[PDB]
């Protein structure tokens, strides 16, 4: 009777069995959350949180746990580097187990609600048939959600009765979970201001509570009731799909462009950090101030933290991997060992040549050396027949400052070429290409993966909304003209 | 109508999907915690030193084990017979290092199976039937108690109990043979006889009953569909089965009072397993099996080996190798 | 360490017979429902 694509429509007019099916879905989601957390904990390596952060290891669920305040683990280590003694129940393992238990209980409740489907609650006394007062159920649920939002904003973010949220520095060097005071001003709408989150949640709470009270009390007008078909559950489905893909687009945008809710230390640097030379400019400024106070160039460059230099590497660019290059980033380059130090390129006349960094679009970029005024001085010729800018014809030397090769210099021809090719793409690091059998190819952040999946889901759900809303409006004709 | 009464009634109700009863109040929480701890430990328990020589043995799935090699390693030899609950350790990590989960699981399992026997009897009483099924179930319970509790008591350490696993079970059996000579003990012989006879009688009874089945079905339909639940007449012909059995072996030799037949069916394996559990219990206090070593001597005095001496040779081979680093003195006392 | 062909052996030998048995049961129940007149054809 029912075609395969129409099979789930039996639960359309059985208020009871719907609940059961929604409960089954909730149980599946919670079970996935718990099992994914357990798997990530199994494959996690909390050894070096400086050059091997969570985002470098392909962790997708761990950042969302650490964002809200989960840092300790039963193994004794902490995501913020320190060590924890006797963490409570609210560690990574505790959260995973709590989710699994919730999944099991929801499964049992779904079974019960499926078996006992004929409840007198889902009946209309006036008519005697199953029915749901949707404009009132909406008021109840919206009032509940407003209460929950206000509670989360006022107690679990401001730290009044909660751990707080993850707050980091402007360059992702020193970040940790702390309570955030709300910002009740124009700056509250600054996306990168964490106080905006607390202010938003408190205000939107106090707003949705009043909206829920209004919907609990006031009945719909007749014109709207007839126009929106506020007696058919499918109009609720279509409108909810609308809201859901709106939210998905918003979240994907905020993660791709970065915000206070997607810190660098949890999801990795954004695409636009590399385009504008964010970290490179910061490193240059710090080196300039260390020279200005008076210090040798080597020790001036040696005061740059390894984390800051690691951010200024193209392997951490989310817009660099491929679609079918599976696995974490460490599978792409290997586990980072140590910084090699900043190379300085000089020619015979003692200039300061800089290697042109490759943009994000390109996958193969030529090695080109330019001076302070952007004029070619040296390169690696593709056809070394009549080349007048070769690295050998124009003697070029390197002098590493502040790193593993600090204070070392090279005058030979092949080694200068090797280091030029290495430094063409960000800073130079030491990698372990044997622990995971890292091939020679880059991979993408959890940032890019989340953005991709959620943008595609939103694009599909727009179509879902279209189809379902059309089906609600054309209900009477939807069987034949 | 009080509250207590109402409760007591719900508890002893015979209309619940699973009977709770008063013994269930002990069986359910205890068995549930035992199985929860067992499932968690089989997956993520860190290595444990069992011989108390600071040489931890891994038994968890996440530590490079499979289903067969994995096990719940018994508690450390340093603890011995001492009670080691969670709260006596200074840290949970230390509790795991000395094999506390083994003690937890085994004590809870023993209490649970005892309560299971009690619950079987209680339901038998509620349903108005003759109350002796739990007597039959006593034999596996006695065997489990002997292997998990009585043997550690006699030997003096929980490290001597059977590890909860496959390869651990085989290791326990081999070491038991080496140190005790279980095979040459008449109670183990009685147990093997009981188990083989139980299998024999089960197979023969099933064959005799199914062979003589009244024709009440076609050929394109399961023979089992001829019987209907809640019948009033026997679906099988006792006369034909007894005729076949008598003609097969002898006329005198044959059971007719099917009640006597079923009583014998219940009696054989149960007494076999009881005698075996008694073998294990007696040998826990070092009353080993027969030692016919160098019993045959020629006129001069030289010794002539029998089949028992090769058993002693194999026992020596197992003995000089088990727990290689644990021993410091010639005798294993 | 372990053989990378077992994965296929274990997973296929678990899933294919299980789906075969589920198929048999589902078709038996569907035929039973079809035989008895009712909302199911």
């Amino acid at each position: 009777a029912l075609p395969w694509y129409r099979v789930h429509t039996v639960v359309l007019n059985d208020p009871g069995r719907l609940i059961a099916v929604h409960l089954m879905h909730t149980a599946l989601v919670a079970g996935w959350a718990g099992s994914m957390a357990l798997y990530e904990l199994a494959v996690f390596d909390p050894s070096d949180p400086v050059l091997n952060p969570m985002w470098r290891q392909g962790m997708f669920v761990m950042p969302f746990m650490t964002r809200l305040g989960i840092t300790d683990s039963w193994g004794g280590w902490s995501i913020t580097g320190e060590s924890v003694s006797n963490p409570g129940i609210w560690s990574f393992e505790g959260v995973a187990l709590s989710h699994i238990i919730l999944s099991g209980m929801c499964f049992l409740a779904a079974i019960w609600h499926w078996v006992y489907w004929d409840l007198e609650l889902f009946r209309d006394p006036r008519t005697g048939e199953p029915a749901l007062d949707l404009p009132k159920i909406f008021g109840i649920h919206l009032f509940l959600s407003g209460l929950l939002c206000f509670g989360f904003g006022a107690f679990h973010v401001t730290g009044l009765f909660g751990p707080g949220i993850w707050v980091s520095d402007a360059y992702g060097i020193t970040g940790k979970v702390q309570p955030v005071a709300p910002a009740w001003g124009a700056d509250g709408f600054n996306p990168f201001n964490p106080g905006g989150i607390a202010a938003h949640h408190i205000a939107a709470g106090i707003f949705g509570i009043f909206a829920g009270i209004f919907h609990l009390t006031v009945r719909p007008p007749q014109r709207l009731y007839r126009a929106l078909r506020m007696g058919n559950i499918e109009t609720v489905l279509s409108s909810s799909i609308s809201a859901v893909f709106f939210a998905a687009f918003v979240t994907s945008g905020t993660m791709w462009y970065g915000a206070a809710a997607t810190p660098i230390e949890l999801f990795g640097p954004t695409r636009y950090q590399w385009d504008s030379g964010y970290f490179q400019q910061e490193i240059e400024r710090q080196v300039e101030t260390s020279v200005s106070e008076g210090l040798s160039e080597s020790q001036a460059w040696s005061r740059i933290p390894d984390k800051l230099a690691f951010y200024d590497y193209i392997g951490n660019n989310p817009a660099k991997g491929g679609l079918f290059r599976a696995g974490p980033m460490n599978k792409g380059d290997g586990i980072a060992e140590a910084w090699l130090g900043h190379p300085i390129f000089r020619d015979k006349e003692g200039r300061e040549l800089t290697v042109r960094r490759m943009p994000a679009f390109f996958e193969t970029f030529p090695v080109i050396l330019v001076d302070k005024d952007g004029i070619i001085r040296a390169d690696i010729p593709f056809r070394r027949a009549e080349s007048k800018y070769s690295i050998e014809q124009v003697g070029v030397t390197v002098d590493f400052y502040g790193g593993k090769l600090n204070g070392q210099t090279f005058k030979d021809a092949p080694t200068v070429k090797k280091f030029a090719r290495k430094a063409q793409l960000g800073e130079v690091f030491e990698f372990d290409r044997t622990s995971l059998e890292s091939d020679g190819v880059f991979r993408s952040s959890p940032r890019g993966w989340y953005t991709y999946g959620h943008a595609n889901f939103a694009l599909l759900f727009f179509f879902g909304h279209l189809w379902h809303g059309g089906r609600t409006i054309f209900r009477d004709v939807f069987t034949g003209i | 109508v009080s509250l207590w009464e109402r409760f007591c009634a719900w508890i002893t109700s015979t209309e619940n999907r699973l009977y709770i009863g008063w013994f269930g109040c002990l069986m359910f929480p205890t068995l549930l915690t035992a199985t929860s701890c067992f499932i968690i430990a089989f997956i993520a328990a860190p290595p444990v030193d069992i011989d108390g020589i600071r040489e931890p043995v891994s038994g968890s799935l996440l530590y490079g084990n499979n289903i067969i090699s994995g096990a719940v390693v018994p508690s450390s030899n340093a603890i011995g017979m001492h009670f080691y609950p969670i709260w006596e350790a200074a840290s949970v990590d230390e509790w795991l290092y000395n094999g506390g989960p083994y003690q937890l699981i085994v004590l809870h399992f023993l209490l649970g199976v005892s309560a299971y026997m009690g619950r079987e009897w209680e339901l038998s009483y509620r349903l108005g039937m003759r109350p002796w099924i739990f007597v039959a179930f006593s034999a596996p319970v006695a065997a489990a108690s002997a292997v998990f509790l009585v043997y550690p008591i006699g030997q003096g350490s929980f490290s001597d109990g059977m590890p909860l696993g496959i390869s651990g079970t085989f290791n326990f059996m081999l070491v038991f043979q080496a140190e005790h000579n279980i095979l040459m003990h008449p109670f183990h012989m009685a147990g093997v006889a009981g188990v083989f006879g139980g299998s024999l009688f089960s197979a023969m009874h099933g064959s005799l009953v199914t062979s003589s089945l009244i024709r009440e079905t076609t050929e394109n339909e399961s023979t089992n569909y001829g019987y209907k639940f809640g019948q009033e007449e026997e679906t099988y012909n006792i006369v034909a089965a007894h005729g076949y059995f008598g003609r097969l072996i002898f006329q005198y030799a044959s059971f007719n009072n099917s009640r006597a037949l079923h009583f014998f069916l219940a009696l054989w394996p149960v007494v076999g397993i009881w005698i075996t559990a008694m073998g294990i219990s007696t040998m826990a206090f070092n009353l080993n099996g027969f030692n016919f070593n160098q019993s045959v001597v020629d006129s001069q005095g030289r010794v002539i080996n029998t089949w028992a001496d090769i058993l002693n040779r194999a026992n020596l081979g197992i003995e000089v190798m088990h727990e290689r680093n644990a021993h410091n003195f010639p005798l294993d006392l | 360490e372990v053989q990378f062909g077992a994965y296929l052996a274990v997973l296929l030998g678990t899933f294919l017979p299980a789906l075969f048995l589920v198929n048999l049961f589902i078709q038996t129940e569907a035929r039973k429902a079809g035989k008895a007149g009712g909302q199911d054809s």
Binding site: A42 | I43, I67, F229 | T14
Partner: peptide, 29 residues
Amino acid sequence: MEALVYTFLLIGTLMVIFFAVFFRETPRI
């Protein structure tokens, strides 16, 4: 990585056991 396969097999067996107790054919007389 085979620990995942072992755990999946054990949990699947337990689920099958669960379905055979609470979702059994009711025997009627």
